[PDB]
Symmetry: D2
Subunit: 505 residues, 4 copies
Amino acid sequence: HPDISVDVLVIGAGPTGLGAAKRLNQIDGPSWMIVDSNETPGGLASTDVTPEGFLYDVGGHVIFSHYKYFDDCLDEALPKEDDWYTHQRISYVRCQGQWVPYPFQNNISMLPKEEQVKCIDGMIDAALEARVANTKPKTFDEWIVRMMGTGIADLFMRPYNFKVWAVPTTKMQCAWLGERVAAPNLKAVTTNVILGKTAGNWGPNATFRFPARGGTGGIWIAVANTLPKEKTRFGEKGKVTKVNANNKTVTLQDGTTIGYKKLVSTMAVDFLAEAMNDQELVGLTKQLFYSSTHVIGVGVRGSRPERIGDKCWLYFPEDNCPFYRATIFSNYSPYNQPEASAALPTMQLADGSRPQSTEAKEGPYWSIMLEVSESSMKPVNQETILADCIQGLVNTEMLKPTDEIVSTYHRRFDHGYPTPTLEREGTLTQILPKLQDKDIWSRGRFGSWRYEVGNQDHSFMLGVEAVDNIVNGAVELTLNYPDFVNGRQNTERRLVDGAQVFAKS
Amino acid sequence: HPDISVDVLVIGAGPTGLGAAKRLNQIDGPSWMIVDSNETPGGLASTDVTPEGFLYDVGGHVIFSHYKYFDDCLDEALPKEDDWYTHQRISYVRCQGQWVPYPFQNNISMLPKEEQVKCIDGMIDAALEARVANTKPKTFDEWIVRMMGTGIADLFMRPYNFKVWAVPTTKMQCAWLGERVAAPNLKAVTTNVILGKTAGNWGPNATFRFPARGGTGGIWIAVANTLPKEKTRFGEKGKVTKVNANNKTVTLQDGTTIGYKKLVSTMAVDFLAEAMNDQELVGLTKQLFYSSTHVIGVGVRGSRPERIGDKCWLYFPEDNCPFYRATIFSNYSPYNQPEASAALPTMQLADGSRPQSTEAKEGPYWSIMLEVSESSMKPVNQETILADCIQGLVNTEMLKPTDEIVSTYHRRFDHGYPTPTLEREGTLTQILPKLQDKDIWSRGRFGSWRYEVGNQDHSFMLGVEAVDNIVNGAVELTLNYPDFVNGRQNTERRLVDGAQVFAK
Amino acid sequence: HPDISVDVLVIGAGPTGLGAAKRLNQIDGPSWMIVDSNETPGGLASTDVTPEGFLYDVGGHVIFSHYKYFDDCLDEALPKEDDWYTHQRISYVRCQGQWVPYPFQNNISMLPKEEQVKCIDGMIDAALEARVANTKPKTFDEWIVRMMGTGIADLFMRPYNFKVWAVPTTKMQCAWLGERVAAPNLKAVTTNVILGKTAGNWGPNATFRFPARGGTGGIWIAVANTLPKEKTRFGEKGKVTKVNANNKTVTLQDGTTIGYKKLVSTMAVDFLAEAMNDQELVGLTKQLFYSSTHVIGVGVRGSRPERIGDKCWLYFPEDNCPFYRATIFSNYSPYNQPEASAALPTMQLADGSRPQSTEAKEGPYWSIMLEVSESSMKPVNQETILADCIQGLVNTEMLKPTDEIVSTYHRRFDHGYPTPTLEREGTLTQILPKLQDKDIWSRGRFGSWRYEVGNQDHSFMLGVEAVDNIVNGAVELTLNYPDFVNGRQNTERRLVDGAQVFAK
Amino acid sequence: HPDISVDVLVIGAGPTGLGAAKRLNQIDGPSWMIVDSNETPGGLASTDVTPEGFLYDVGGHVIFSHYKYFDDCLDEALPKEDDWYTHQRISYVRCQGQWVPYPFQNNISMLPKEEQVKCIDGMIDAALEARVANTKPKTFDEWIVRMMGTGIADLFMRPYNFKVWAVPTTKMQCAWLGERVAAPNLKAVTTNVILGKTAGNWGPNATFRFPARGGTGGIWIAVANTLPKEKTRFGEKGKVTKVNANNKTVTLQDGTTIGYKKLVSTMAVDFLAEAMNDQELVGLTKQLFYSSTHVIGVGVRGSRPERIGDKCWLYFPEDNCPFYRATIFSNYSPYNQPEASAALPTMQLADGSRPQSTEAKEGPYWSIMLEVSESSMKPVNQETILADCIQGLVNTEMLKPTDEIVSTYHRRFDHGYPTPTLEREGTLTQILPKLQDKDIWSRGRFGSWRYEVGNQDHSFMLGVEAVDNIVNGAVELTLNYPDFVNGRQNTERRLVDGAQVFAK
């Protein structure tokens, strides 16, 4: 008999595990327990802070919720109106010395005329081909070129996606992008070129909310806090080392054994296979491809520069900088960096030179967060990446050579992005049924390895739906039908359902 | 304070209400109650019997299940292997003196060659057009011509569908038919013509199961039997006469009042509106269109004729008979008609004449079930419809003039088919949400009026999913995404879920 | 026995008839003569002069030669270098206050950005439709929209062409436009829009040459001058009044009879039918359609305005003026109007006011030539059309209100354009072969009624090829295959062929 | 000064040179002479005879005339109705043991069903592709697959054309096939399949006429006989050995020199270049591809076998025989072989064995004429080809092993077909204008090297038109616009034109 026994054991307390736990706790039927090897819940949705007081998420983290249930839990966790800040979804593509409003194709009036001609000519070819198309695109690359035409694809989506995924667009699938037909909106694009007009895809109703304090990681701490503490086990005490799927027993690092009837595993599925000592699953899961993420944070002295303005996130297809995306994290919340009266010495100037004075001075401060990808196809020199990113900041005109840097941050995350390669589904449809046959619901960004349902809200719901499948026979819609859950507002499932209402009387 | 109070009240004990009841009874959380004006549950999935012992369902009833939950409840209700008979899904189209295996277009090799030419030419036009199509069809008719071409459409789907829906194909939407692109499989059609082959869409894996006894109605009586009797109110005592949506109170015919928190109503939504005395809802529901169904049953003396054989259901596009579909109901089960030893006099010959003898004679017996549609666009002479059907049976060579008829059945069901008119959705998206905001889940063949999810399994699951939405925040998938539930095996929800397992 | 007998009689001495005559004269085999009711040859390619000394062609006449034969004869007729002026083919469309270089679609960068959007959107639609099109356009209108899209069609080709043809574009065929597929060059149009480029279809190698003196009429007088006079009969003496096709006899105004073996008739075919007293043919020819042309000329005091510059011809789609086309005729030759030292009083200002001073002042002078169409579907008030045109010149900013007009000209030509109606070919198929069988070669702008081969060179060659068919069994290529002759440099036939070289 | 001088010198008295001569003789203007290395006029349109009396053309020669002028000259040459025989254009494709009527695709009902399925499926692919095609095919091969689809292309046109051209279909252009859009008539093909119908493209309307005597060679002998003898120089005396283009002098075998103003050369343009000793042209003409033709004749004892019947010519795509085409030459005229009473010994049986008796026996007789192509890409063993052809006849069931062969004929023609390779035009547009600059009209099957205008009627007209260009400035339409001349009835040019009528 094992040290402790529950009906449903949840491994991991990132958004996915927390979702499983939130639904288990709501149902309050079967006994359950959630473990995590980290004392702080949140997983990849956590937040670090430098010794100098600059918070950084694990790269740009921006919530768009497809589910009311997710909204219910965020609201419960952070209920005050000043627990959040609201911003418009402002993004740009850095291209040939310009900040081009997203979406790129609707804004190429900013490029030289000769290049506009090439772009439009390419999209004309794409529109004429789309008119007689009778096949679906088979690769990400085909999808890109059919949507954009060659000239536009070459400027942004092709080089950008390589810098993101660290694999060529020709080696990726495109089903994950959804069911929308790959075809240009030629009229929209030429209309903006003719009018000499720019237009981003944001406005008063295209907004997101960011937590006032603690960064994204604050959300999950708050959510976790709403669970019964005695049913949680976070820290070294909660680190799983072995899973005997046959005995439905899990062994933690401190030797504790847990018996379960159903397992919800949100750890990376390749780590699960190793922990199960299953050679067959180990074999299969090493067929899955992923990239690592280097997050670099740069704290800068001064009020926010006019040139940065209200920008939120930014895309970098060009090769004059190593990052694919930058986030003006200081725009998300004034509490993401020290207040103006806090004193910090300048560490270096943006151009790498030493400051004239070593003395500590006041702010105000602003803050840039950058992401660099790494794969077996795209190596990252960890000893020079910070300095190279900072050089990239000068090259892209985000910093002047003279800008004062008061804080740096660099961290490498081994499992960053699960790759939508051509082979992914072929591999997943062998792995998941084998785990399912053992009453193991492997779910999450790396639990189920599906980027298209790999955001915070998706992950959370993957955990919720896993519990709902386990207990109520619910369809696991997010897991199996990304296009379905993404094409609708999911209003039916709520933090308070009829069940708990009727029970309370 | 009303006479009774329950958390969830279910109106109607046809397949839909029974689904609601079964899910409620499984969850066993909220209190609930199910009422019906009929002593026998089943609704349009019931079975009648003539005084001579011939059973008849409400027209051809053949189950194809999309849901394990449904199978679970059917197995629970009728657990024995001898409770069921298995049959292949054998259907034909009567056309120009021949029985053409379904699907029609794959079997036009049976028609005269000149006609095959016309058919193939039309489908060639449809293929070339589909090659450059970039719009979806907007009407049932357009959908048909794009799938089949003009020649084929005119031979079967066009005239047949008018006989079924009792409204022209140009007046119906086509979304209900699924997301599949409207375009011909030219190669499969020409291949069969070239090889001179016929081929039905059945075989050892395209089967269905039919209850050994009591006809389709027997399923629902047995499913109803698994419910706690004290939670059911069936008969005149359970006939709903008034619904007060404001006070969440229902009043039965015998004056009984029932308070509810949530209402699952499976009666026809136009009847519900009337019971609510809600004049706005009455106006909206009057915008919906439906056809009535005449079910005609004919019991015949003799061993099953070889010309009939293993046929199960049959389609009739042509003018020489008023029915759109016939079912050889005696093939579905030997208990659908009297044993051979049963003595019965001949009532008439199939040509309409009086029999030579009035003496009761033995069988064996076989049995034909026919359906005729009626609507405001397609009236039917009620007084002659039986005799017209019988003459139709002679015209199509299903009966010989000399065949001996020993039993007849005819019943008109006012609400037969909810019609997928062009207008249906615009009207429903006004009705269903308005009812929803009053905490009324109106669901089922006429409860929510969507034929594409209007079979027994769909109906049953509409009831299940309505309860599951009310209690467990489930998505009402069947109701809102026909294409979704119909395109997969719905395996997740079972009669015993983790919930009930952990409970013990 | 008739007064005169020749092998080949040529009726009419405009370009077509003179073509016939030049070929007959070069071959110098069969006997022949040529008649015309006018003393001065040239037909609709003649030139008038006002009492004030301003020349006017019969509307805008610009030669583009598709044939070396035609060149040879023009060079023979006018061999001196200073017999000609050369100009670039500079044309513009007047639109929304702007002179838009031709071709219009390549120059819409001159219009407001909002107009450009509408034009490009329209042309995108046409490009996507052209990608799947598998029929040819049936009407001029279809052809226009397929080529240009709606937005561009509506700004220029549609309204302009109604103003020209005096019938709606929907009533005309489109084969006469040639064999090019009706489809937009979307890339070329969008590229010029993107670059903000304008670009005319002219330059150092897109030129025309114009006669130094006598206007276009000078060419035909001089070509006619190369024929032997005794084979000509021009004036009242040569007016044909009767054609007896069966007796191969023609009667002149003065009673002279001329017998012929072959007849080349270049007068309007409807006139020919009347002269033939052939009611079958009168009936048929009356089915053809044509428009009348009002040629208005305006002589203006002053040096050529900068706003006018080197413009040659100009198109006017808009309804702020009655003319469809203006020509800056004073740009074609300095001898189209008086010398600067010539004194002329001002007849009126462009604003319509007439000054009290009759003082004759000197020049220099410039000149505008205008055309207004008339037909049964578009009447023209002959009494006001001059003043309306002049006000149109003010509306389009060709003239200032204060400009001083020193000469006016207005003449109506009954047969102006032979219209390419939908019915034209059907009707000509009944007419031309009927005449052919009577040994009558009816040819020319109204002789054979085909506008696409109705220019001076085409006409000339229709006459040449008629003779060549009569004498040498040549194919009448220009008559039957406009697309053929228009798509190549016709170099083979020359004023001096091998036959004449060897004969020496 | 040269031994003899003329305005126009014609080299070669095949159809092309004879066409030039006929027109010169008719015009009777410039002086002229025609020479040939062969005492008998006709070139590749001549006829041989075996010692046993069996006539053979240079392969199957069947006249389809596109020109009235050609008809005129043939009718002049052989004016009696009994100078000609008329036959329907009857042809078949030998495929998988069947004689499939031409055109092949309309008759695939004769093939096994599973193969019909493959053919139709391929043509369906081609039809759907043609529906969205926006390019012209670039190779003969692409043109074939677009017309026929893969399956049909593979059975006939692909393998057959390799056997004809002795180069792959992928190495040939396709413009020579005309302007017709490359697309299948899918309905025509499916219809005959569905109906199980076969039908050739012949009937009482589709006929040809063949000379009663002397084979095709007899036409040209008779036409040449209409020329003034004194203006012809045929035989060893007429063999051109040198051409001095600069001096405009030709040198014959016997040393005679002829001066000309204009040269119409109908010899192979590669031999012309050699005779001109022009190294630039010799290099260019060596870039032209051509195949050699082997003609095999087989005379057989017996009345015409039923299996052969009224067949005229036959196509052989398959590898079980070396010939690409066979002609039942004995069907063209009873005078193409000895009369029945003529006695001839049997030379061998079809299976190659000796006859039982070596004595002469009577007919009747019939006759097969066969064509085998040869090129650098496809060698022919000259020593075994006769035997291989005869075996092919047995393999194709044209001869029984027992049939008695009474005559054999074999002859190799080095210049057989001028090949429409991808490069042909690039080369010819360099060669022809250079010759044209030296007043040399190089014209004919190998004179101008264009197969699509390489028949007897085209060749004749190439010469006629060459003269007409030289003397009358006519356009050379046949030479430059094959599609134009082949798409019309050319009725204008006659053996007696107006010119000759007016002269008398």
